[PDB]
Amino acid sequence: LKLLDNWDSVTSTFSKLREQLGPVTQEFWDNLEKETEGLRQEMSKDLEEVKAKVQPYLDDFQKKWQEEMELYRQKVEPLRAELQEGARQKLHELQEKLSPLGEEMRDRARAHVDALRTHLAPYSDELRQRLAARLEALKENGGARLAEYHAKATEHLSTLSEKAKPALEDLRQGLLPVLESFKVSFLSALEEYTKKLN
């Protein structure tokens, strides 16, 4: 009944709060209408003064922008022309290097790679010998390792049998009384929770 009892107190509070909400909304709206009224009168200024002023305000910037664009247009031509001349010369000068020095670089790269290719020829072959040498060792040693690993695995399993059979059996035999004790304790606990919490 505690929940329903306190529920009444909440409901009565809500009732009186709702009774207050009326005057509150009335006063709030009444005052809001005043604030909005001031803003309504302000509208004939904040929006109207700026509407009349928006003409010369935008006009000033607009005309200046026109001049700025005109000035930019009168300069964009010679500027682009100079940049064009500069680019032409600078790029032509660059091409004067990208061609001969470029080809020379390619020719040098030929010898660079050719020497590398020539060096890598016996290198790769000797690397094959290295691989074969390592492979032989790793194969012979690997075969021994596999055999050893197998023996180890066998013995590991042999000793694991002691855990799979004796240890497991012994543990299971010890778990049985544990489960029995657990079941009792669980039953007791279940009853406790049902007696005091239900």
Ligand X SMILES: CCCCCCCC/C=C\CCCCCCCC(=O)OC[C@H](COP(=O)(O)OCC[N+](C)(C)C)OC(=O)CCCCCCC/C=C\CCCCCCCC
Q: Which of residues 80-139 bind ligand X (CB under 6 A)?
A: 113, 116, 120, 123
Query: C-beta of 46: minimal distance to ligand X in Å?
Result: 7
Binding span for ligand 17F by CB under 6 A among 76-84, 124-132, 134-142, 190-198 = 190-198
- The CA–CA distances, whole Å, from 23 to 10, 26, 30, 146, 195 equal 21, 5, 10, 92, 53
Binding mask 48-67 for ligand 17F (x = CB under 6 A): -----------------x--
Q: Which does 62 bind (CB under 5 to 8 A by kind): ligand 17F, a second copy, ligand X, none?
A: none
Rounded CA separation 137/131 (Å): 10
Show contacts with a second copy in window 137-166 (CB under 8 A). 137-138, 140-141, 144-145, 148, 151-152, 155-156, 159, 162-163, 166
**Nearest in space to 161 (alpha carbons), one of 149, 172, 151, 153:** 153
Helices of type H across the chain? 2-46, 48-98, 100-162, 168-196
C-alpha gyration radius of the chain: 48
Rounded CA separation 126/120 (Å): 9
42 or 70: CB nearest ligand 17F: 70
Rounded CA separation 96/107 (Å): 17
Q: Which does 132 bind (CB under 5 to 8 A by kind): ligand 17F, ligand X, a second copy, none?
A: none
∠ CA 141-143-146, rounded to 5°: 105
Kindly tell me which residue out of 77, 93, 103, 180 binds a second copy, with binding defined by CB under 8 A. 93
Determine, following the binding rule CB under 6 A, whether residue 194 of this chain makes contact with ligand 17F.
yes
What is the contact surface with ligand X in residues (CB under 6 A)? 17, 53, 57, 64, 113, 116, 120, 123, 156
